[PDB]
Every structure is written in C-alpha cells, then in structure tokens.
Design a protein around this nucleic acid. Structure first.
Lengths: 65, 76, 76
RNA sequence: GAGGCAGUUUCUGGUACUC
RNA sequence: GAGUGCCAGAAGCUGCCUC
C-alpha cells in the first residue's frame, strides 16, 4: 500500500537495499537491486520508473504483492 | 499556501488504506512535435485515465479521474 | 524567476569547460546533537570544501569555495 | 533540529527527435 | 522561433519512516 521503493526499504529493516545502473529509436534504462539474498532487474522509459519496476520486482521475489 | 497536487492526494489516500497504486503511461500518439500521452492508473480496484500534451498533464488528469471515484468510500 | 544557486552555477561552468565534477560528503563529525557535515568537491584540478549543520548547507559552501577559484581563470 | 524514501510545483543548464 | 522526451542541478511545498 506504500510506494514500491519505500516498501523495500521498510521491509528489509528486519535484518538497506543497494542499487546500481546498467547499460534504439526507443532507448531504455535498466537498474538493478542488491538485497544480498537475490538480485533483481527493472526497465523503463526514464530513470524514475526503472527504479520503481526494479523495486516491485524484488517485492515480487519476496512474495508481498 | 500551496495546494496539493492531485497525484500527491491519491498517493496518500492509498497509504491510509493499504491500497496498491500503479501509474502507467498507456501509449503515445502523434508526431514528436505534437505528441499526446495517456496515463491509466489503478488504486486497488478503482481506475482512472487521463490525456495530455505531456506526461505530467496526462498523469494529473488520471489522478483527477480517480479522485472522483474515491470520494465514495467510507471514512475512518 | 529565481536566482542561480552557487551549486547550480558550478555545473554550468564545468560543462562549458569540459571539466569533471564530483561533490561528496566527507563525513559527519561531532556529538550526536552538534553533528556537522563536511563535503568537498573536485572540479578537475580545482578543489573546495564546505561545512554546515545540514548536508545541503555544507554542499552550498563547498560550491562557494571552488567558485572563487573558478573566477581566477581566463574567460576565453 | 538532523537523516532517509517518495510525491509535486517553479526555475536553470545540457541534450535528442520533430515542426 | 516552437513542441515533446531524456540527463543534471537548485529552491519551495506534502506524505511516510528513523534518530
């Protein structure tokens, strides 16, 4: 119910998530998530939606939404 | 002083109720010098859509459309 | 119609002269209540530091420090 | 008072595509 | 001259969290 990227921050406070940035006529951004347990990716038309997709793809790998 | 953006209103109503929120740009139309954007958004089960000459605008109009359909739920 | 911040200025000057820019927070120093932030910035060979009770403040000052040195250069 | 995340309004610089 | 996208930066405002 919170916004996807704060929920990851406020969900890994049981045990601080880490992000990094990766490399057409419709070019794209791709950002990665590093929570230790696993690593997720995410793409979007700008940097902003690429980091919200990257989050909501690791809240899907942890089974929340 | 400054009013709240409809987008921000939506985001906070949805935190108060643990509803999942997802704005997305449906599609783009027209030549680059006359683009038309459309954003569809879901707040749990409710939906709105907006159009505009820019991404900012269409998003706002989408937020508005949902605020009309969120004025019907019960308060706290 | 707002003014240009010293921090914003540095980036414009550096871009015109193709110089790399990096602001970084050196550290937080002092007791938990009187903690003071120090940030230093490197614009090529030029360097400036700045200090403040908040990050944004100290960044501003660091920008002021380099900005004086970048007034010592030829405007060709 | 300080930090973080998000949202947003205004403004600045740069750039790409198009008229 | 104009439109839109994208990157960077600043100021303001809102929400949530931590100290």
């Amino acid at each position: 119910g919170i916004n996807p990227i704060s929920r990851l921050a406020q969900i890994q406070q049981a045990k601080e998530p880490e992000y990094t940035l990766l490399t057409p006529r419709r070019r794209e951004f791709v950002m990665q998530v590093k929570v230790g347990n696993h690593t997720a990716e995410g793409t979007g038309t700008n940097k902003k939606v690429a980091k919200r997709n990257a989050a909501e793809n690791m809240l899907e790998i942890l089974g929340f939404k | 002083h400054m009013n709240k953006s409809e987008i921000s209103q939506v985001f906070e109503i949805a935190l108060k109720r643990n509803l999942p929120v997802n704005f997305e740009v449906a599609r783009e139309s027209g030549p680059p010098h006359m683009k038309n954007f459309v954003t569809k958004v879901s707040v749990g089960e409710f939906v709105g859509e907006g159009e505009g000459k820019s991404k900012k605008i269409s998003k706002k109009n989408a937020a508005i459309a949902v605020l009309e359909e969120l004025k019907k739920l019960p308060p706290l």
